[PDB]
């Protein structure tokens, strides 16, 4: 459950540590982003000499949330924190190469295939 | 907040058309003492459905 002003950790080696969601993409008046949903972000914290830097505006996909995913049996998987994987603005493929931390099968789509592979879990 | 015109004697009575009280539709009689009482209540002498369950 990711809305505007929510801080997210990063699940990649892009160079960002902390980012802020500035727009939930998709529909008009669309309140929240869940796992597998693209968002617009600004980088509030980055590591120096990294692919990205502070104040850079770009896209990310949510991979983990504290609200968590829901499964067809009724099971919920919730994460300790909210995390994202940065994506290029006009390509939407990932900026990084490593994926740190577990992901879910809500990302088992042609667009996010290069995240589930490089993840350590799912 | 307040009226622009004095309401009449007539409007006042129409409002009160539902202010009449209903009377007791019937009193009940005790099988043993013959006292009249409110139904499902005890008598004034202490009887309910023929039994004397009060001291007085």
């Amino acid at each position: 459950m990711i809305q505007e002003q929510t801080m997210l950790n990063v699940a990649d080696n892009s160079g960002a540590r902390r980012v802020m969601c500035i727009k939930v993409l998709g529909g008009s008046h669309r309140r929240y982003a869940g796992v597998g949903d693209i968002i617009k972000i600004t980088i509030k914290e980055a590591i120096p000499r990294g692919k990205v830097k502070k104040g850079d505006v770009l896209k990310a996909v949510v991979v983990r949330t504290k609200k968590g995913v829901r499964r067809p049996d009724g099971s919920v998987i919730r994460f300790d924190g909210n995390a994202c994987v940065l994506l290029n603005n006009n390509s939407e493929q990932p900026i990084g190469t490593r994926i740190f931390g577990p992901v879910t099968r809500e990302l088992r789509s042609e667009k996010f295939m290069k995240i589930i592979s490089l993840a350590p879990e799912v | 907040a307040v009226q622009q015109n004095k309401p009449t004697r007539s409007k006042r009575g129409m409002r009160r058309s539902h202010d009449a009280l209903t009377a007791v539709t019937s009193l009940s009689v005790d099988k043993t003492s013959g006292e009249k009482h409110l139904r499902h209540h005890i008598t004034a002498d202490g009887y309910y459905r023929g039994r004397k369950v009060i001291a007085k």
Binding site: - | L38, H40, H41, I42, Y48, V53, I54, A55
Partner: protein, 120 residues
């Protein structure tokens, strides 16, 4: 909405309600007949009847339980010694409510609440 909720608020807080009922429970046990208001009398059944039920199995833990909910040892004694034995065979319904009219001061509907076997 109040759907499927038990428990009369009785225009009191929780602490006042528990305390009054503890008081009303002991007065009934002690007098075996008390005049109260009809809605108070209906709740009084939900406080007093479980104590008579507890008063059938005379264990020290039961005397302690009754003392916690009664805070009177005359009432615990009369429960476990007189009321508990006296209602040993009865599967519930130790009290009877008998409506008795309206209070002069406030027109509250009244009711006498009694142990079903007074014998006075």
């Amino acid at each position: 909405m109040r759907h499927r909720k038990s428990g009369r608020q009785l225009n009191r807080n929780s602490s006042h309600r528990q305390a009054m009922f503890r008081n009303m429970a002991g007065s009934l046990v002690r007098h075996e007949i008390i005049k109260t208001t009809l809605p108070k009398a209906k709740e009084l059944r939900r406080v007093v009847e479980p104590l008579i039920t507890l008063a059938k199995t005379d264990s020290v833990a039961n005397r302690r339980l009754a003392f916690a909910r009664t805070r009177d040892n005359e009432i615990v004694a009369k429960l476990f010694n007189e009321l508990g034995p006296r209602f040993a065979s009865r599967a519930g319904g130790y009290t009877r409510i008998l409506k008795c009219g309206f209070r002069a001061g406030d027109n509250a509907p009244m009711a006498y609440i009694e142990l079903v076997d007074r014998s006075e």
